[PDB]
Amino acid sequence: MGPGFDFAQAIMKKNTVIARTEKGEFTMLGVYDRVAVIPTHASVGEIIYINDVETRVLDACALRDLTDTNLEITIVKLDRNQKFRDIRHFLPRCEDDYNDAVLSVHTSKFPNMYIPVGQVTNYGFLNLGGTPTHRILMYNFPTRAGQCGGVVTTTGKVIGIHVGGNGAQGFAAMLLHSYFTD
């Protein structure tokens, strides 16, 4: 409808796949080459389904901060025959608050879904499903089951992936440029 949705659409159309694990279907953001991200609670194994195609996982790393605290981001390298567009220059370098964010989902259950969530707070610490988690972003939207892995963007920045909610607020794990240096 406007430049927020325009940027979100551009990311969804070229840089997302549908990932299926034993824990469900997730929106998965491709970042560069064969490297993508997914919430750690997807429990990625040796094999994953990507757009309903059996795919070997070449590497998977559940990220934690230097205090050995969960970040809820898993970085996956896929044995895929095609590279993602490189979107690393849209990733923030530092922890921040944001105005006017969009949460975007693409699954069998919710295809081509875009949600204007508004103001995003650098919340920091969250007890997420019982697990102490750092670098959490919070938005005042009543997010629901099936939105996990959803991409959080502003105009010009890809800032996080949706990892949970409490029925009134939604929570995303930050994406930082330093996660994807090579």
Q: Which DSSP string do the residues of 33-49 spell out, in sequence order?
A: BTEEEEEGGG---SEEE
Cα 163 from chain centroid (whole Å): 8
Q: How far apart are CA 81 and CA 102, in angstroms?
A: 30
Which is the catalytic residue, given 25, 72, 106, 134?
A: 72
89 is catalytic: no
Which is the catalytic residue, given 25, 106, 134, 148?
A: 148
The candidate with the shortest Cα–Cα distance to 111, out of 27, 20, 5, is 27
Q: How far apart are CA 164 and CA 15, in angstroms?
A: 21
Q: How far apart are CA 112 and CA 114, in angstroms?
A: 7
Q: How far apart are CA 77 and CA 95, in angstroms?
A: 25
Quick check: 62 and 50 in contact, CB under 8 A?
no
In degrees, to the nearest 5, what angle opens at C-alpha 66 toward C-alphas 62 and 71?
A: 40
In eight-state DSSP terms, residue 150 is P
148 is catalytic: yes
CA atoms within 13 A on the CB side of 161: 28
Q: How far apart are CA 155 and CA 9, in angstroms?
A: 11
The candidate with the shortest Cα–Cα distance to 40, out of 163, 179, 174, 180, is 163
The candidate with the shortest Cα–Cα distance to 18, out of 56, 53, 60, 58, is 53
What is the experimental method?
X-ray
Stated resolution in angstroms: 1.5
Q: What is the dihedral sign for C-alpha 154, 158, 159, 165?
A: positive
DSSP assignment of 73-128 equals EEEEEE--SSPBP--GGGS-SS---EEEEEEEE-SSSSTTEEEEEEEEEEEEEEEE
User: Tokens in use for 154?
Assistant: 């502003």
Mention every residue, 6+ apart, whose C-beta is less than 8 A from residue 109: 25, 146
134 is catalytic: no
